[PDB]
Amino acid sequence: RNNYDGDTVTFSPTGRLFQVEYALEAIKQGSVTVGLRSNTHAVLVALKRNADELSSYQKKIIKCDEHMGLSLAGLAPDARVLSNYLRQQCNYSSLVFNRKLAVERAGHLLCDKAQKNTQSYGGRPYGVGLLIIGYDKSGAHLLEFQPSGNVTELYGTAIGARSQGAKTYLERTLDTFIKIDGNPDELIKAGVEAISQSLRDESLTVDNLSIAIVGKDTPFTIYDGEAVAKYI
Amino acid sequence: SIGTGYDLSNSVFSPDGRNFQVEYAVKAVENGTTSIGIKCNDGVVFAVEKLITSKLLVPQKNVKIQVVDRHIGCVYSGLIPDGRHLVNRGREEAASFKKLYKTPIPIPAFADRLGQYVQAHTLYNSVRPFGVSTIFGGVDKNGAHLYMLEPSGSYWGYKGAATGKGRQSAKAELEKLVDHHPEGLSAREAVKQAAKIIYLAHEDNKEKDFELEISWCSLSETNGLHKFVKGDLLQEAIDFAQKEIN
Amino acid sequence: FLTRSEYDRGVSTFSPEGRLFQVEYSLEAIKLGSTAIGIATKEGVVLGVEKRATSPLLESDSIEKIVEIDRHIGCAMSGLTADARSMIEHARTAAVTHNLYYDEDINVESLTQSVCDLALRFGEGASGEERLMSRPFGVALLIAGHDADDGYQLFHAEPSGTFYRYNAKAIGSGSEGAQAELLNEWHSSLTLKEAELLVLKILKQVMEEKLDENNAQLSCITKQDGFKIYDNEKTAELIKELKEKEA
Amino acid sequence: MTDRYSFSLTTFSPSGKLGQIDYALTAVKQGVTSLGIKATNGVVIATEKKSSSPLAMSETLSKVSLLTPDIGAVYSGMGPDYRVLVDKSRKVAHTSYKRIYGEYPPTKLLVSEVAKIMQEATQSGGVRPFGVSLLIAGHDEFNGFSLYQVDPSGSYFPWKATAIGKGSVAAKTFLEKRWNDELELEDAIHIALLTLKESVEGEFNGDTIELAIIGDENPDLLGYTGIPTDKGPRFRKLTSQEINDRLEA
Amino acid sequence: AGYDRHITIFSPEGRLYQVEYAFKATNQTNINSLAVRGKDCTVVISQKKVPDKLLDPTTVSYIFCISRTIGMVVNGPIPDARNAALRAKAEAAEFRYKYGYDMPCDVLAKRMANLSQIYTQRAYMRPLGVILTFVSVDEELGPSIYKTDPAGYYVGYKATATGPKQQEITTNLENHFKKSKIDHINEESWEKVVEFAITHMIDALGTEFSKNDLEVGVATKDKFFTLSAENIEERLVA
Amino acid sequence: LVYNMTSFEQGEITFDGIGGLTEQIRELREVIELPLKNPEIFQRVGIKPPKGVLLYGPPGTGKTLLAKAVAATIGANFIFSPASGIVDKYIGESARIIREMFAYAKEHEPCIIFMDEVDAIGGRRFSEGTSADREIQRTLMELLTQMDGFDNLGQTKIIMATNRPDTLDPALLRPGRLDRKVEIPLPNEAGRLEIFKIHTAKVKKTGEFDFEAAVKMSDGFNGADIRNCATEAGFFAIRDDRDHINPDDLMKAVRKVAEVKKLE
Amino acid sequence: RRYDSRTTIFSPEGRLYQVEYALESISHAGTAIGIMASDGIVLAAERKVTSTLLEQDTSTEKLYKLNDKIAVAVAGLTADAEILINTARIHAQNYLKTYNEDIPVEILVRRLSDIKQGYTQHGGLRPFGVSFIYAGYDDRYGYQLYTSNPSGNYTGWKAISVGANTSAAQTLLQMDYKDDMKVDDAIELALKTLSKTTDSSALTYDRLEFATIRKGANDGEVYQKIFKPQEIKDILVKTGI
Amino acid sequence: SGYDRALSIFSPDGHIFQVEYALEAVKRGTCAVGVKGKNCVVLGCERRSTLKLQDTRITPSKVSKIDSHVVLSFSGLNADSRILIEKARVEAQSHRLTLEDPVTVEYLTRYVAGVQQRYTQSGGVRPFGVSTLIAGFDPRDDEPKLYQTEPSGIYSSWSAQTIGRNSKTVREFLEKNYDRKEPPATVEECVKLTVRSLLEVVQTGAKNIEITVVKPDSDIVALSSEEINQYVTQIEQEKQE
Numbered sequence A: 001r002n003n004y005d006g007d008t009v010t011f012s013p014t015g016r017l018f019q020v021e022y023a024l025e026a027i028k029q030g031s032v033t034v035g036l037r038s039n040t041h042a043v044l045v046a047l048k049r050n051a052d053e054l055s056s057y058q059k060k061i062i063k064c065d066e067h068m069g070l071s072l073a074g075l076a077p078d079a080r081v082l083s084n085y086l087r088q089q090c091n092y093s094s095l096v097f098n099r100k101l102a103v104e105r106a107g108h109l110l111c112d113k114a115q116k117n118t119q120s121y122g123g124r125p126y127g128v129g130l131l132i133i134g135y136d137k138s139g140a141h142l143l144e145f146q147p148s149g150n151v152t153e154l155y156g157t158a159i160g161a162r163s164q165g166a167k168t169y170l171e172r173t174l175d176t177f178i179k180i181d182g183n184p185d186e187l188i189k190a191g192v193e194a195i196s197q198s199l200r201d202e203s204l205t206v207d208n209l210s211i212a213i214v215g216k217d218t219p220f221t222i223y224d225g226e227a228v229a230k231y232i
Numbered sequence B: 001s002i003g004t005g006y007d008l009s010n011s012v013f014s015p016d017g018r019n020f021q022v023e024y025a026v027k028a029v030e031n032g033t034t035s036i037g038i039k040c041n042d043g044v045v046f047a048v049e050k051l052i053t054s055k056l057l058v059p060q061k062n063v064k065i066q067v068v069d070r071h072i073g074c075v076y077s078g079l080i081p082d083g084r085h086l087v088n089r090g091r092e093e094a095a096s097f098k099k100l101y102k103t104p105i106p107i108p109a110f111a112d113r114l115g116q117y118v119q120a121h122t123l124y125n126s127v128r129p130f131g132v133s134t135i136f137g138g139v140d141k142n143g144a145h146l147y148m149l150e151p152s153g154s155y156w157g158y159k160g161a162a163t164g165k166g167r168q169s170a171k172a173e174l175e176k177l178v179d180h181h182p183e184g185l186s187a188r189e190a191v192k193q194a195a196k197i198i199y200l201a202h203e204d205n206k207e208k209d210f211e212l213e214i215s216w217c218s219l220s221e222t223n224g225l226h227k228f229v230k231g232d233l234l235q236e237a238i239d240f241a242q243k244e245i246n
Numbered sequence C: 001f002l003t004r005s006e007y008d009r010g011v012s013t014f015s016p017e018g019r020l021f022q023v024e025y026s027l028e029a030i031k032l033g034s035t036a037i038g039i040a041t042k043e044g045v046v047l048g049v050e051k052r053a054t055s056p057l058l059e060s061d062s063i064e065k066i067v068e069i070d071r072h073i074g075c076a077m078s079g080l081t082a083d084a085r086s087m088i089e090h091a092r093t094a095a096v097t098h099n100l101y102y103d104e105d106i107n108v109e110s111l112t113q114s115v116c117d118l119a120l121r122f123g124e125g126a127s128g129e130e131r132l133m134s135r136p137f138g139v140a141l142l143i144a145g146h147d148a149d150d151g152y153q154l155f156h157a158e159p160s161g162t163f164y165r166y167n168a169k170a171i172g173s174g175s176e177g178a179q180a181e182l183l184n185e186w187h188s189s190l191t192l193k194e195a196e197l198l199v200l201k202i203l204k205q206v207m208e209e210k211l212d213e214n215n216a217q218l219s220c221i222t223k224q225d226g227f228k229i230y231d232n233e234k235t236a237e238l239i240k241e242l243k244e245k246e247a
Numbered sequence D: 001m002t003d004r005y006s007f008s009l010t011t012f013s014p015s016g017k018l019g020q021i022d023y024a025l026t027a028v029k030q031g032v033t034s035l036g037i038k039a040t041n042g043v044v045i046a047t048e049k050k051s052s053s054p055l056a057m058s059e060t061l062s063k064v065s066l067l068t069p070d071i072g073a074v075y076s077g078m079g080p081d082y083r084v085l086v087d088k089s090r091k092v093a094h095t096s097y098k099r100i101y102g103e104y105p106p107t108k109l110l111v112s113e114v115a116k117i118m119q120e121a122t123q124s125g126g127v128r129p130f131g132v133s134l135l136i137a138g139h140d141e142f143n144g145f146s147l148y149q150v151d152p153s154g155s156y157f158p159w160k161a162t163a164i165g166k167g168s169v170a171a172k173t174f175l176e177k178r179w180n181d182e183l184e185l186e187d188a189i190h191i192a193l194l195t196l197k198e199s200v201e202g203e204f205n206g207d208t209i210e211l212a213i214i215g216d217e218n219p220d221l222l223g224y225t226g227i228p229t230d231k232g233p234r235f236r237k238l239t240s241q242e243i244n245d246r247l248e249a
Numbered sequence E: 001a002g003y004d005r006h007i008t009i010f011s012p013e014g015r016l017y018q019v020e021y022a023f024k025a026t027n028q029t030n031i032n033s034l035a036v037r038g039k040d041c042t043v044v045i046s047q048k049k050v051p052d053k054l055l056d057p058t059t060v061s062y063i064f065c066i067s068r069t070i071g072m073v074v075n076g077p078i079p080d081a082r083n084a085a086l087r088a089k090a091e092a093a094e095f096r097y098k099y100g101y102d103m104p105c106d107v108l109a110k111r112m113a114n115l116s117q118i119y120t121q122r123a124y125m126r127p128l129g130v131i132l133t134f135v136s137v138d139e140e141l142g143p144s145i146y147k148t149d150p151a152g153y154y155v156g157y158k159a160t161a162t163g164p165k166q167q168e169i170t171t172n173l174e175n176h177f178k179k180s181k182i183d184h185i186n187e188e189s190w191e192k193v194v195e196f197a198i199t200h201m202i203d204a205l206g207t208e209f210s211k212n213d214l215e216v217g218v219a220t221k222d223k224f225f226t227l228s229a230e231n232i233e234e235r236l237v238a
Numbered sequence F: 001l002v003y004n005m006t007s008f009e010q011g012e013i014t015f016d017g018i019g020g021l022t023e024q025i026r027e028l029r030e031v032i033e034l035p036l037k038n039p040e041i042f043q044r045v046g047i048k049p050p051k052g053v054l055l056y057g058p059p060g061t062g063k064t065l066l067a068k069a070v071a072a073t074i075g076a077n078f079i080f081s082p083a084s085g086i087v088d089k090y091i092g093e094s095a096r097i098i099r100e101m102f103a104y105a106k107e108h109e110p111c112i113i114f115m116d117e118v119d120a121i122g123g124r125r126f127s128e129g130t131s132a133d134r135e136i137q138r139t140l141m142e143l144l145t146q147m148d149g150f151d152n153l154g155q156t157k158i159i160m161a162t163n164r165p166d167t168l169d170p171a172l173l174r175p176g177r178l179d180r181k182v183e184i185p186l187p188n189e190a191g192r193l194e195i196f197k198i199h200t201a202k203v204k205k206t207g208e209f210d211f212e213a214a215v216k217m218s219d220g221f222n223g224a225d226i227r228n229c230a231t232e233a234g235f236f237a238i239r240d241d242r243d244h245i246n247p248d249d250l251m252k253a254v255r256k257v258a259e260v261k262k263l264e
Numbered sequence G: 001r002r003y004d005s006r007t008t009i010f011s012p013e014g015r016l017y018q019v020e021y022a023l024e025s026i027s028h029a030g031t032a033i034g035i036m037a038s039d040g041i042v043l044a045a046e047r048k049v050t051s052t053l054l055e056q057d058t059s060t061e062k063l064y065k066l067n068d069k070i071a072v073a074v075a076g077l078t079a080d081a082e083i084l085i086n087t088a089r090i091h092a093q094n095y096l097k098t099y100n101e102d103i104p105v106e107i108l109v110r111r112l113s114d115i116k117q118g119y120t121q122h123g124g125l126r127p128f129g130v131s132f133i134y135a136g137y138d139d140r141y142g143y144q145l146y147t148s149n150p151s152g153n154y155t156g157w158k159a160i161s162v163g164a165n166t167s168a169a170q171t172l173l174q175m176d177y178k179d180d181m182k183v184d185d186a187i188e189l190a191l192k193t194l195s196k197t198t199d200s201s202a203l204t205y206d207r208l209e210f211a212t213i214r215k216g217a218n219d220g221e222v223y224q225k226i227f228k229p230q231e232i233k234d235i236l237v238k239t240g241i
Numbered sequence H: 001s002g003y004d005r006a007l008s009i010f011s012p013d014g015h016i017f018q019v020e021y022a023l024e025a026v027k028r029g030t031c032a033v034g035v036k037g038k039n040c041v042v043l044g045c046e047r048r049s050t051l052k053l054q055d056t057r058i059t060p061s062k063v064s065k066i067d068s069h070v071v072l073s074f075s076g077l078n079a080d081s082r083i084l085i086e087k088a089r090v091e092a093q094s095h096r097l098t099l100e101d102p103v104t105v106e107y108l109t110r111y112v113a114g115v116q117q118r119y120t121q122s123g124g125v126r127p128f129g130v131s132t133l134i135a136g137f138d139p140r141d142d143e144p145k146l147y148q149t150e151p152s153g154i155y156s157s158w159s160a161q162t163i164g165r166n167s168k169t170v171r172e173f174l175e176k177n178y179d180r181k182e183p184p185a186t187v188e189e190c191v192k193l194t195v196r197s198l199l200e201v202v203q204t205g206a207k208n209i210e211i212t213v214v215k216p217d218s219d220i221v222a223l224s225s226e227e228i229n230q231y232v233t234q235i236e237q238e239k240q241e
């Protein structure tokens, strides 16, 4: 019996934490979502699962501010907490300083929240990993998030159930789509052959797909619905 | 491993007299990367055994060093967030000091604060010890200093220091330098010997590709502030070891 | 291979499967509760409920699974009828005060988000809140109503947070059989009177007793009349209408 | 051979008793002896001390303590749950009775306050009682002398002559055979010693004990002379040289 | 069975166990110190062990000069000790500002020990695994030692010791006092008392020492302080 | 045989070919050898010969090699009864084993015991499961009566080895027997070369001497350390197929294998 | 798994086993008796211990007082009994200064009982194990006699008892009682029961104490009489032990 | 199992336990019946005849009015019933204060259940081991009604209902006799309906009963012990053989 895993106060008998290490299998029983970078324009894509042959689909992408957004993967209601949190900081460092909030500063304090739940008796870890993008006065970025706190600045990654069937596309084609700039019409095409390698016969209906994009001269914005049959 | 029933929580002494839960935390950093810091005649230096996941990592945009205001530096191994929730209190704790006592912060009294903020987090039952082994040092009116930090709370004033996977390698690879250089060093003759050590350390992990970062604060080459490195200095300091080994 | 039996006595503990269980059990309480139905034409929305006659000396309007929550919204309880009251007292405290802080009429997608912003108050609060409950409370509402933005729609609000915009819901003691066959009896091009028929039909295949004006209830929404439920008299005349039609 | 109900102190067994207050008293025994006798003119208190390391200045510690000029106390049990109890006690003599009635308390309205310090321990779980059981001696103008006892369960008796600690049953047997209802003071001291002889080890001199008494006024202790009725204490403890000679008989 | 993983539970035989573990958790350093009075002064020595060769030995210290005319030498692990020395450096503001003058040692042990008593009635904190020894030069009662402990049984020893070699040092010390029948030591000079102390203890356990392997504290009136490697040959000079 | 070696009273290991002590071993010379040698005095005084002894301390001391060795000098039968390997979950049958051996020892004419890890007997009883701990004293208490009943023999000696002394405080079993309780040492730095001189013998190695060995043996003061260093230092001269030791392998050995002998 | 570790738990059989484990505690306590009759109420007592070197002479244990009208009798724990009466002695006076008249006895117990209910559910706390008897006089109901129970339910009795072996003592009271007794029919009754269901054969004056309420104030309200030893050692010999 | 020793966890069937264990406690209590005629309500009780030492001057009373147009009856255990009765009558007189208007009966009934919902939801608390029911008339109308309440915190409106010992015999009985096809009109048949309903439990003891009825215009009236004793006989008068 792997004891010592009743709560996030106790260590392993080695130096490991199990409740955290059990959270990371939550993202693995959600859907997939992916994110790229260029030196001018970045992007993310996500397949959103139904509830039956009749329901709607799941609001998966959410505007935290105009120069920055995210794309969740895993347990959603615990993501709404974080999404509201960014929406306050960004609405705090513009009523006071007026400065565009640096995207890297966001992940530089979410980690200072997923920790302070890891310590004390009560609550849980934020059982979801998620991706962040954003343009700023420095350049485009991508920042991920996994529940344990560790965020990382990347060119492009993906997460969720059956995602490593996409990462190899990236590690295979990384040197190409990073110099690219000025023409998002094909970068956005990149993830689609990146994600379509990682499917259980899903076949990518127009309704079954969400895209969000940012850029220097472009705000954050969602492309779903009939405006996405283009990017099949 | 010996005692069983007395591991489920802090604030329990084994009958030998020993709280095992802390005895398990420090068995974590041993499953963490490597970092060091050695004292110079003028100032101090820092290093790190950075690791990777792929080429996907942005080169030189995922720093593991973190800084304090008044020309003071910090680095931490192990579970990096707990080592960051601790220094996040540092920049919070000095502005409780220099706001009041009109002056920048001394290092030893600063170490006492972090050296017992940890103690509270092994003095209760509803908390967890910080699973790190922090390093920090800098400059003050009375010269340069260095320390090492550890979840038991028993910090010390060292000459050089190490942790992580690469303790025993740097247990001796640093001990030599105190023998060959009683006269002290400069930062220029130091960083040409620190990045040496990191490459000696990675030998245990020849597969896991890596990266390297350095920090150094001295009153000679920086006039008493904490600065990173750049340019053709680390571009050759690496080569002070990339060629020294092979 | 020690099993689920241990990590299932606390709301705030995962399991190596990677999941919670208490919230996963809450969904297995509405199952005990009576049925509930909701399907939406373009002309209007309808609902439908069984009432579980326990004995013949209960004034059946004593208990309610339907609420005139506002001018243009309705609901449908299914599960523990008690803790539902902790929602609607908070729900129609919103649809009112939104007519104060904005002096207009409301949209559902705030409302269904509001109640679903509430059910998760037993843990992390959305708006950085605190804890007020030890017990996620098991009911599965059906927030039908109209907004001038998208028109007539309904929803399904668990205690587990998330919602869904069904076009045809069914939850209670019949979700397995009913929502199977609404999938072959849903048309985008219905009337209203093409709707109250089947909702009586489907509610007949699913349950125990023969129907009656007393052992059922239903309602319809329309933007101008509002949450107009039906008397026992009117509802009785559709039941007869089914039979001579069924011949 | 007890189980499942001494774990805490808020679960009545079927037999109908509380958990570990019965077990707190088990240490009270295992502490050193003690005693106190009520005369017709005074009251006495006495304990030995088995000072572990002889290098200790035994004068520093004091088994006996002050509560008023007129009231004094002693325990038989755990030490460090005494030297805090007294400050928590005499702090109550001031704020409770004195500053709203002018003058110092009688003994029982000072002992009843001690109990409410005690029962506040046995109110919840995981918060232990005090490992001691006290006795108090004092005087007033309403009913005069008294000798009370205090247990960790909040209860408080009276008594006439008593011992507690190890030599409890043995001593109290002797007291029943070496007591009178109308005796005097000085013979009481001639009892307590040879009562304290009963369960003694090591030496018996005036250095290795500490005993006190109460009686008539002792205005030499006062120091603030010039006042008719500002009379001095009824309390003083006897010096080793004042005891080592009495022992000579 | 319980009874051990909690503080505030008595055993049926009366003795609780958890503090007794802390009474045992003092000597994880294998250190043993010594204190001894004088005629107007008092001194405290302390064994040192810095085996690894990267520690600036000046800062490693189980000594904390809390204020004027006070000193303290600790056992138990170092971190808990700092967590006690702080509170001492806090009260000595208060007792001065609140009651006017400086704290005597005896109160400072009496106060500090009540705090470690309160952590044997409830689970606010665990009890510190220290047993510490204050020294001073009193303005009224003269030099003094006081020997605290976790539970809070403080007493004043005329000259005592601590560590894993108490029985031994308990042997030879009292042998000395009965060769003269006096509690304190004559020979005023606090310097010369060090020569008395160290030679009294090398022969006790039987090992000669260097200058870079001890640390000492000295309690003159009007000040308490520490000293470096001066006066490190007179013990063998004669 | 069934249980133990019994040494046939003559298997003559050298109690002096060892880097142990002279005071302790001479302290034991009193209680065993003097009566069995010289009964003319205990008879003259009428005192009965002694009743057993304890030898505390943790291992490395050699607190079992001396025992059978001095037993070989006098020539008694050396056996074991490790209390860790005596406990049985059943109600009785921990005391039966006690009863077999005091009998079976007397089946032999002389016999002496070597109990070890006897803290399994002397437990603090912190659990207080009366179904168990009522029996723990039951088997223990039988020892107290099985050991000194009618046995008026001068042959049946007793030893008890007990690492972690004073962990037992259910009963210290002080009064009467245990006529000694030896103040056991650890291997002092002076004794290192007293010990290394032992195992180094029976080797052709060009000496393999050094004063850099006690510094290496500092904090690794356990006899297994020296047995094993001489082992593995013997495995390094063959690491290159050499002919004789160099002392650097010793300075290499103890420095590089006391590591496990200081961390775990 | 049995349902006793906390008093906030119903059993599957529909009961709260901790509370029964309090109502049994009084069985360890000492006897108490009250009788209601024409002229005025009477009470009795029996100290659990009657040893030599402790004075139960001037020190009442079982018979405290709440007001010149009302007096009680007490059982059970002692630390969890004083605080009740030290609440009752407050609530009465805090009913007097506001309404300028005396207390009706029914309100007191109604207010003193419903706090014991408070120490039955809200919190993981002990219920106060005490079984008071209430004796007093109010105008809207004349003479009165109530009884408590650490659950928090009371009862208006005529003449009952509690403590050790009351179940037998009731049988010695159920059948040999007459409502028209004046005072002394209840006395020789009362003292005869304790003589029958005791622990030892002493019945010494120290072992027991009495009390009385009397309306003998001639158009004045009421009197009490808590008897010193000289008023009760003379009466039993005047009654024929 | 272990799923039943708290209030803040669900068994895998989905249902909590500590609540419906209360329904086992209330089953251990006395009957409490109620019926509404066309223009008058009634209420019953399984009063006990315990013993000849309770004061006949004060019979006990399950029933307890809160205002002159509302009453309340219960069964279960009395201590936890005493509270919400006092939180009720307090709440009603407040509604007269704030609104200058008496209470609609439905508003009251959702206050008593509005506490039986929190006293199970938030832990650190035990429920109210009681079921109750409400009875009376709305102001300014003759509309009869009674409501039931139970510790799960839900309110229904039966026309006839019972709680406690052998309720199962009764709730089927009135179904066999009472019916909305013929609603009664006045008292003497609502009572002649009810007094016979008790008989499954009463085992022919008429010192074991009480009864009340209801008025419009904010009145009530209790009832005597002979004023049933005749009704003991007309109900038996049919039972000739």
Ligand SMILES: Nc1ncnc2c1ncn2[C@@H]1O[C@H](COP(=O)(O)OP(=O)(O)O)[C@@H](O)[C@H]1O
Pocket (backbone or CB within 6 Å): F018, F019, F020, F021, F058, F059, F060, F061, F062, F063, F064, F065, F195, F198, F222, F223, F224, F227
């Ligand atoms: N004083 C010593 N001199 C030489 N070798 C020793 C000494 N003590 C122990 N040893 C070595 O250690 C072994 C004995 O281990 P020992 O410490 O007796 O185990 P235990 O303590 O469990 O009986 C012997 O084989 C011997 O080689």
